Structure formats: C-alpha cells, structure tokens
Design a protein around this ligand. Structure first.
Ligand SMILES: [Cl-]
Lengths: 255, 252
C-alpha cells in the first residue's frame, strides 16, 4: 500500500523504501508499450535491469482514454515490479508527448491513477494550469501519492535564473520533486543547466530536484548529480544504458 | 628515439604514437619515488596498469641536485616503461613542490632532461620568468622534446577570464600543451573551471589543453574532458582503472 515520507531538512522523499535525495542519484527507466501485451512484455524485460524507479509513459499507450484499460495496464506492471516505485507519466502533446488529451482529461487521468492505489507517484507538467495542478497535488497527497512536476525545453536552454525560477515554481505548486530537462545548443548550455542545479539546490530547494541537459553533449549532467544536486537520472534498458549509468554513479559515490 | 608531431587542425600533439587531443582524454600517472630503488619499484608496479603517459615527479627525488643521479633514474624508468611517453616534471616550491631550486638550477635541470634523450616531454611553470621559459621552450624544441606548461592554484579558483588568459599566455610562450589546475572552494568554482575550459577551446586554442578542478568536488573535471575540451587527466594506480572505465563510457 502506497506510503511516502519527506524531509525538508534532509531534502529527501522516501517512496516504497527508496530514499530519493540521499546517497547516489537514482536511476529511472521509462516503460513504453502501445498495448497491454507490450506493457506486460516490457515490464518483464525491465525486471532483469538494475534501476530504482519505473516510469510508465502512459502517453505511448493506445487505450489511454479507456479508464479500465489504463487500470489493467498499471496493475500488470505492479504485478511484475512489486518492490520499486512506479511513476505514472502522461507526457502531454504540448510537452512532446505521443498523443493529445485536453487539460480536463489529463487531470482526470492523473486523478484516476491516484485513486487506483497502483502507482506511487504521478507526474504533472508545470504549465498544465496552476489551479488544477494545486487541486491535483492535494488529491495525490490525500491518497499517499507523491508528485513529480516536470518541465521540458527540447530546443534550447533557458538562462540559469529562468531554470531556477521554474524549479521554484514547482516547489510553490507543491511538487515533492521538481524536474527539468533542457536541450543544449552549445557546450556552455550544459554548464548553464549545472549552474541552475547548484543554485537551486543550495539556495532554494527544501526537497530533492531532478535536472538534465539532453543529448550526447549533456550526458555529464546525468552522471554528476551527487556533486551538483540532481537526485535522479534516466537510463535506457534497450541515452546511456542503465548498466553503464550505475557503473559511473557507483564510482562517483565512492568515498 | 624522441620525436613528436603536432597539428592545429584537430589540435593534437603526437608523442611516441599517442595522439593527445584526439578521442578520449589520456591518463597520466605520476612516479613519486625518493630513491632510485623506489623509482624502479614504482615503475615496475605501474608497467601493467592501463595509463597513457608516465609523469616523473622529480621534485620528490632526493638526488635531484646530482646530475648523474637524475640521468641514471630517467634511464631506469625508460628501461622499465619503454612504450609510453615520459613527462619530466620538477614541481617548484612556489607551485607546491617538495623541494626548492633556484631559477637557474630549475632551468638547468630541465635542459639536462632535454639533452638526455630519455624524456619525451618536460613541464615548465608559467611564472618561471618569460625569458627563461622562451629559451627553454626553444631548447626543448631543438631536441624534439615537447613542452607542457603548467600553472596551479592549490587554494582557490581564479575567475574564468583569468584562467583563460593564463592558458592563452602559455600558448604565446610556445607551450605544446597548456595545463592548469585550480582548487574549488564551492561547487560553482568547479563550473568556473569548466567554463574557462570551454571558452579557451572555442576562442583561442590551436593545440590541446589540460584543465582540472582539484579535490573530490572537482572530480567531474577529470571525467568530462572529451566534451568540454581537456585532453588529459591524472589518476593513481580516482583510480586509473575507474578513470578508464568512465572515459570509455563517455567516449561511446
Ligand atoms: Cl510544462
């Protein structure tokens, strides 16, 4: 049964025994399956991999508008991955997601995920609609479901202070874990993302944050979270591989 | 026999078949023996480790003021490690070195290393004195010996523009490979060193550069050279094995 804890002083969130914000960064893998058959096979393949959090990319699921189908898929994943936190993420079309839902539908989808008791966390996008996000965060918390809030820029890297402000806004909206991913156009852009990470974590955060500079040029941002302050990083099962990611994180954690 | 190449197209220096500035950053390990028996035992212990350049920290050598002893030790190392470039480095007292030498002794020590034919590269400190550096750079080049020019700040990180200007000065003085190492006092300081690395690489470098932010906090500067533009990194036998592991992953 879902249960999470969080410490503002330690800047941690504990979900299904995993302490996000302590020790080495956590590895998140994303499950993408079009049908229930695909979701089940992918979860089995993922069971063989060394990761910490399973993200289900619901926007890749064809039957997302059928509540019963979404519940069936979530249950199938939970049966295979019984001891790792499950993050429910519908990436909206606006945010690069594979299909479109209206705001109301997206909110209802996330509320249904909270109600199911099958997921430990939900992802809500920063620019969804502040009033609905606040209401949904409250609903999630009332049911012991934690909230990751996300923002993506697939084309550029905003100024450091703008990245910081977005992470602060996510905190303000009640996110348990603010998350941002930006695309570098130059090497300096990767450093901008790391600078924002350090400034946020040292000055404003009272919880864990997740940050990433995308593309091969920004890979170092997926590896250096322990020193700069990103609490988790994404790896690929089938990007940097989960095995290589753990190898490097382990090296950097050694005292 | 000593010979090196260098190109301003891909910004490389090739020494004993090793192309510095191409692909993944190169790993340098340092020999710090006090006596010839320590130097030989260390070189033998390092022979099978996976690194690219052997640095001899001559300031740790007790008989550094005995010319014959230095030449004997260089020969002993060369005999054991035959397939890797040998970098002769006397770290001066001002730069944190273990012993003190007059400017005159320091320059003569480096000239003697060049003349021996036993070393592929020498390290010269940026603030040794311009006339002395230029003459020694010229002397090394006359004998097919490459020059790494170095600068260290063991207590703080200068501003990015200051770091860039020092690297640029090393290029102007004729360094084949400018090298700088600074100490972070904050995490932002680590990023300042990386920023200087990127700016130097895009604005002024026409050769490989080596940069580092010291301490556990600055470890990412030892790992991320391929993307940010540092051509080499030091490890010890973070370990050399772990360093190669990470560099290989980042090269993929
Ligand atoms: Cl958003």
């Amino acid at each position: 049964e879902n249960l999470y804890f969080q410490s503002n002083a330690m800047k941690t969130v504990t979900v299904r025994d995993l302490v996000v914000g302590e020790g080495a960064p956590k590895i998140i893998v994303s499950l993408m399956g079009k049908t229930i058959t695909d979701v089940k096979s992918e979860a089995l393949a993922y069971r063989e991999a060394d990761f910490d959090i399973l993200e289900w990319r619901v926007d890749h699921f064809a039957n997302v508008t059928t509540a019963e189908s979404v519940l069936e898929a979530a249950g199938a994943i939970r049966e295979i991955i019984t001891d790792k936190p499950l993050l429910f993420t519908f990436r909206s079309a606006k945010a690069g997601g594979e299909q479109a839902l209206t705001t109301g539908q997206y909110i209802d989808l996330n509320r249904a995920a909270v109600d199911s008791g099958l997921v430990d966390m939900i992802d809500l996008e920063l620019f969804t609609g502040d009033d609905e996000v606040k209401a949904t965060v409250g609903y999630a918390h009332q049911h012991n479901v934690a909230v990751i809030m996300s923002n993506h820029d697939f084309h550029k890297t905003p100024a450091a202070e703008e990245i910081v402000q977005r992470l602060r806004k996510m905190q303000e909206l009640g996110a348990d874990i603010p998350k941002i991913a930006v695309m570098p156009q130059t090497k300096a852009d990767v450093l901008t993302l790391l600078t924002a990470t350090v400034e946020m974590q040292e000055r404003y955060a009272d919880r864990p944050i997740i940050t990433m500079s995308m593309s091969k040029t920004g890979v170092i941002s997926r590896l250096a979270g322990e020193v700069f302050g990103s609490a988790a990083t994404f790896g690929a099962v089938k990007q940097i591989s989960v095995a290589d990611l753990r190898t490097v994180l382990t090296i950097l954690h050694q005292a």
